Design a protein around this ligand. Structure first.
Ligand SMILES: [K+]
Ligand SMILES: [K+]
Ligand SMILES: [K+]
Lengths: 97, 97, 97, 97, 97, 97
């Protein structure tokens, strides 16, 4: 067990508990199509952290071509990092239909 | 704007705030390389949600070739959903090196 | 100052912080009308707590004429309390229009 | 299901989980009078958001005459909003006895 | 830096943020003595974790002579751990005076 | 029941729920030595709040000689408070072996 692993654990557990808590309440109210549509993209987004000189800190793979920057945080980070939140373009494509 | 977008916005802001707060406190103590290392995989993990009949709810594209399941939640979800948290196998490979 | 006041203070600050943070991020993307619409009913919902013998614990004045129960929690509370979350029926009426 | 509804859901669930978690711990320790007195006003407070020109964004009804501003947030919101947290005057009247 | 250190850092930052936020809101309303009184024991409580075989997991030095168990959690932990929250008996002594 | 007690309750419950949630996930994955080593010092750290004139607001006892300042917050508090987070020196001594 390492710090990196414990940090991943904390994100995972955040998401697990949110998903389970939500379902406990919404299952009767929303249809299956509704709840499944709600969770389709949940958690799929990631932050690309770019350092102050343009060097990407976040590990990325070839997938990135199919992702779209949805939200941006700039000028807030004390090391001059830029944070971009990227989600599947497929989500926007399905919304448009 | 939609509910889905707002949900994405909530995950985004959670991670933007976490990253910026941490950097504010750790900046002095850790080296840039140490913080970069800390954030290399931060937020790259995602959940794969499977319903009780084995049908995947989460959008999936590409392959899980280079992914590994870090954590699983089963038996907790009201709908019988299984939740798996997947991360880059590269992270684990790099821990070896 | 009392415990009750401090509890009220905690709910207050939670909502003040949520509103201000959201506005900070969404300001650019959404129109003022869109954000106003988003916040029209934000925090107007309240809980009505009923004990296991049907006696209401929450202060109530006025009438529930123009309220609707949006969400209920039963069978979870250690004391056998039932919890109902009530919101303005106007919100739902306006969703129709 | 809409964004507005999901947002209400998030407030409701916050309150439900807090109330139930608290009761799980305090029921043995506090008397019934104690815990019921603690929850009498819990969640009844709301924020009145006023825009930068004096126009109230929050929906309000006639009830407002029986409410009292307990806490105020000003100069923090990036759209120049003023946030006022209002609770039943009845709470202050009962404290004074 | 280690996982243990990072965990300590997370508890630290939680309390730093809580203290500073509260002071920001309560500063005007309460007197310095009132806020000082509020924070006299804030964060001095600690948990003692005992495994199912009665062996203490938490580091302990000194004595519990002048401590009191304020809250206990049993029967909830997957490993059969018992959790006790210990605070200065002085706090309770001062509430009498 | 007083505000001070309710505030202690909130810290206690935060820690209890974190410890139990973590164990629910990590017990299978980490060894007993691992999880027990993780929790050895958890919650043992405290904040020493010093007012703007050098007067310590936090109650402290003789124990303090065996504690070490791990993290510091300065210049953020609106009353000019200094916050120092102190942990057992024993933790650092065990890390070094
Ligand atoms: K992700
Ligand atoms: K309310
Ligand atoms: K502590």
């Amino acid at each position: 067990y390492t710090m990196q692993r414990d940090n991943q654990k904390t994100l995972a557990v955040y998401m697990f508990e949110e998903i389970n808590r939500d379902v406990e309440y919404l299952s009767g109210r929303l249809s299956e199509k509704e709840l499944k549509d709600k969770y389709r993209y949940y958690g799929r987004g990631y932050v690309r952290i770019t350092d102050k000189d343009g060097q990407v800190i976040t590990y990325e793979d070839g997938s990135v071509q199919d992702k779209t920057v949805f939200l941006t945080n700039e000028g807030a980070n004390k090391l001059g990092w830029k944070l971009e939140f990227l989600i599947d373009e497929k989500m926007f494509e399905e919304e448009i239909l």
